Every structure is written in structure tokens, then in C-alpha cells.
Amino acid sequence: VKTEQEDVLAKELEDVNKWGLHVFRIAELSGNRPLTVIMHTIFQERDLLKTFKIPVDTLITYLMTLEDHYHADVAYHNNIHAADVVQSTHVLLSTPALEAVFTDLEILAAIFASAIHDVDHPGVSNQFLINTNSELALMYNDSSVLENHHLAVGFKLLQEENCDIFQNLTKKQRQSLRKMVIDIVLATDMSKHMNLLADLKTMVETKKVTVLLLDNYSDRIQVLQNMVHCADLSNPTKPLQLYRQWTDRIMEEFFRQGDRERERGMEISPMCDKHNASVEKSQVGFIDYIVHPLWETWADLVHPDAQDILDTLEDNREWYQSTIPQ
Numbered sequence: 001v002k003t004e005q006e007d008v009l010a011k012e013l014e015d016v017n018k019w020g021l022h023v024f025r026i027a028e029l030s031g032n033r034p035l036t037v038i039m040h041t042i043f044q045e046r047d048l049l050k051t052f053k054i055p056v057d058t059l060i061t062y063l064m065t066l067e068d069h070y071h072a073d074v075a076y077h078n079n080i081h082a083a084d085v086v087q088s089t090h091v092l093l094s095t096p097a098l099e100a101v102f103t104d105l106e107i108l109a110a111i112f113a114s115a116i117h118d119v120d121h122p123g124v125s126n127q128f129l130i131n132t133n134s135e136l137a138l139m140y141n142d143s144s145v146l147e148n149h150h151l152a153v154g155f156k157l158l159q160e161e162n163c164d165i166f167q168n169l170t171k172k173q174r175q176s177l178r179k180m181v182i183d184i185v186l187a188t189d190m191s192k193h194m195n196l197l198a199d200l201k202t203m204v205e206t207k208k209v210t211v212l213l214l215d216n217y218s219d220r221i222q223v224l225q226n227m228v229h230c231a232d233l234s235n236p237t238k239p240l241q242l243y244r245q246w247t248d249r250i251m252e253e254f255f256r257q258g259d260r261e262r263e264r265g266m267e268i269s270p271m272c273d274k275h276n277a278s279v280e281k282s283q284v285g286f287i288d289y290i291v292h293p294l295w296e297t298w299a300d301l302v303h304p305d306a307q308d309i310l311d312t313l314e315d316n317r318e319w320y321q322s323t324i325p326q
């Protein structure tokens with residue numbers, strides 16, 4: 001029989017299919033295991049263990065290992081952010097306009113990619129790693145340094161004791177899953193945002209419905225890449241109580257990087273100077289130039305499924321706009 005804390009956790013997890021899940025409460029209730037508990041719930045919900053013959057002990061060992069490689073000392077890019085992107089992707093995959101569009105393998109790829117997408121994040125940007133001549137930037141030739149590392153770690157961790165969750169997949173399933181996971185995580189690099197959005201806009205213009213109709217791999221992967229990119233950029237679309245916590249965390253992470261740049265005599269990166277900050281102006285700018293253009297295009301692709309998400313985004317933007325000190 002479940003512990004009283006485990007029962008409160010099970011009750012919170014009943015909202016796993018809802019936008020606005022109490023992810024921070026789940027992080028506290030699970031004893032800092034939001035990624036493990038949320039992924040296990042989603043895998044059970046979607047019958048992924050049965051479909052891909054994943055031993056339950058193998059899944060739990062891998063999830064705990066993966067979660068252990070997210071840094072507890074990093075304010076934003078940690079296991080809570082990973083659990084949040086996983087759960088947001090899970091909700092986006094269930095959108096009516098995408099019903100019966102994706103295979104179980106494509107679903108597994110989007111969820112697995114979301115889980116590993118920021119693993120072993122040091123809390124600093126690609127540029128900081130490049131400017132310091134870090135061994136990571138040297139290994140990855142200054143190109144999507146972090147994103148390449150997140151993927152290499154996510155896959156390397158499958159080799160630890162009883163961690164190979166893909167042990168019963170055929171070589172064909174593994175190569176297809178691997179290619180999709182790579183295409184998705186590499187699309188999370190912000191340097192790819194503008195080209196990803198431009199291609200999503202092109203698809204919206206020439207949109208074919210049967211519920212969406214996606215004929216080729218190129219179209220299917222573009223939707224999956226944009227979906228996980230939307231989940232990664234979903235904080236401003238969440239209820240304000242959740243969004244504000246995400247903002248405090250990213251600002252704390254940015255300010256810690258600025259402190260590191262300052263003590264090293266480096267130029268302080270945009271939004272990283274705690275002495276010359278505009279938290280509210282930075283959120284309006286992020287929403288106006290990145291989040292709103294992306295979510296507006298997604299809302300067009302899945303019309304009218306994302307209407308409430310777009311309405312919350314617009315309400316959160318006006319809350320921050322009204323907060324700017326004059």
C-alpha cells in the first residue's frame with residue numbers, strides 16, 4: 001500500500017494530461033524525482049512498456065540515471081525543466097488535430113527526446129563554452145555544443161547497468177528512433193529557431209487535412225521538432241503562477257552566468273547583468289519576438305486546439321507589459 005506522501009503524489013499525477021500541471025509540487029512530493037515519476041506515468045498511460053517490451057526495472061533505473069545527470073545546482077536547466085518539457089510534449093501529442101497521425105515509435109521519440117534534451121546542462125550558454133575554450137566546445141567544433149552533448153549523454157546513459165530501455169527494439173526501430181531523437185534535440189538550439197519557424201509557416205500555408213495529413217518523413221519530423229521546440233518554449237503559455245517561477249529560475253541562471261563573465265573580465269551576455277537588468281522588458285521581448293510568433297503559427301497548424309494556450313500567452317504578456325517600471 002502507498003505511503004501518504006505517495007498517495008498525494010498519485011493525486012497530483014491525475015493532471016498529467018492537462019496543461020498547467022503542478023510540476024514544482026510533483027518535484028517536492030517525489031523527493032526531487034519529477035522526471036522519473038512523470039516519464040513513468042506517461043509510459044504507462046501510452047502503453048509504451050508493453051509496445052516496446054521495456055522491462056519496468058530497466059525503465060526506472062534509466063530514468064533515475066538520466067535524472068541524476070541533470071544538475072541540482074542549476075536553477076532552470078535541471079530535471080524539473082526536463083519533466084515539464086516531457087509533460088508539455090505529452091499534452092501536445094494528444095491534440096485533436098494530430099489524432100492517429102503519429103506512430104508509437106514517433107511518440108516514443110518525441111517523449112524520449114524531451115526527457116534528454118537538456119541533460120548535463122552546466123547552466124551556461126554555448127557562447128560562454130566557446131569563449132573559454134572548454135573541452136566540450138573543442139569536441140563539438142563550437143557547433144550546437146550543448147545540444148550535441150545532451151544527445152551524447154542521453155544515449156551514453158543507456159550503457160549503464162540495467163539502463164538499456166531499447167534492448168528489445170529491432171535494429172530498424174533503433175535507427176529510426178535514434179535519427180528522430182537527434183533531429184528533435186538538435187532543433188532545440190535557439191540558433192535554429194528562425195529557420196524552424198519559417199518551415200512551420202510554409203507547412204501552415206500548404207496545410208492538408210484528412211485531422212492533419214503528413215505524407216513524408218520531412219513533414220513528420222518538422223512537426224515533431226516544432227512540437228518539442230514549443231514544449232521547450234511553453235513557460236509563457238502556462239498559468240502565471242507557474243510562468244513566474246520559470247522566469248525567477250531562468251533569471252537566477254542568467255545572473256549567475258553574468259557574475260562568472262564579470263569576474264573573468266568577459267563581456268556580460270544579454271539579460272545576464274543583475275546590475276543592469278529589466279526582467280519585465282526581457283519577458284515582453286521574448287514573448288513578442290520568439291514565443292508568440294512560434295505559438296501563433298502552431299495554433300494555426302492545429303486550429304482551434306491551441307486557442308486557450310494562445311489566450312494565456314497574450315494575458316501573461318499584458319501582465320508583464322503592465323509591470324514594466326516607468
Ligand SMILES: CNc1cc(Nc2c(F)c(F)cc(F)c2F)nn2c(C(=O)NC[C@@](C)(O)CO)cnc12
Pocket residue numbers: 188189190191232233235236243246247250282283286
Ligand atoms: C521563462 N523564461 C525564459 C525561458 C527561456 N528558455 C530557453 C533558454 F533559456 C535557453 F538558453 C535556450 C532555450 F532554447 C530556451 F528555450 N529563454 N528565455 C529568454 C530568452 O531570451 N531566451 C532565448 C536565448 C537568449 O536563449 C536565445 O539564445 C528570456 N526569458 C526566457
Ligand SMILES: [Mg+2]
Pocket residue numbers: 117118146188189
Ligand atoms: Mg537546451
Ligand SMILES: [Zn+2]
Pocket residue numbers: 081085117118232
Ligand atoms: Zn530546455
